[PDB]
Design a protein around this ligand. Structure first.
Ligand code: CA
Ligand code: CA
Length: 139
């Protein structure tokens, strides 16, 4: 069993940072079986593929991967950007226990089969900082 979840619920980075590194924490004791969780960024209040990247991929939790790090590319849009953020959601949990990709309901999963130990919403608030005369609106 492995609960996959974001270390933080909100991540902030500069637009000029290049990438934002998020960390997924994995709990459940010990588990060396390879757990796969699929992720993508959500447009939220912006556009993925226009403002910042969608970094759609799958996180491979290998033996030793008690934590995983993902990075979202920031795209060069320079618009007056006020609290321009997106949401990272996790979905599609698949477990490699057998040598086949389709692990038939194998008990080395997240919860029941799949779930996530977060909203799951890792809000990535990009600090444009260029025209960012932002106001703190609570999420
Ligand atoms: Ca933007
Ligand atoms: Ca900007």
């Amino acid at each position: 069993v492995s609960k996959i979840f974001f270390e933080q619920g909100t991540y902030q980075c500069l637009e000029n940072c290049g990438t934002v590194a998020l960390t997924i924490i994995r709990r459940g004791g010990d588990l060396t079986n390879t757990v796969f969780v699929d992720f993508r960024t959500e447009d939220g209040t912006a556009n993925a593929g226009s403002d910042y990247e969608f970094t759609e991929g799958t996180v491979v939790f290998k033996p030793g991967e008690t934590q995983k790090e993902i990075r979202v590319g920031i795209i060069d849009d320079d618009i007056f950007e006020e609290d321009e953020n997106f949401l990272v959601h996790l979905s599609n949990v698949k477990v490699s226990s057998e040598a086949s990709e389709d692990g038939i309901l194998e008990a080395n999963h997240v919860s029941a089969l799949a779930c996530l130990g977060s909203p799951s919403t890792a809000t990535v608030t990009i600090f444009d900082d260029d025209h960012a005369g932002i106001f703190t609106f609570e999420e």
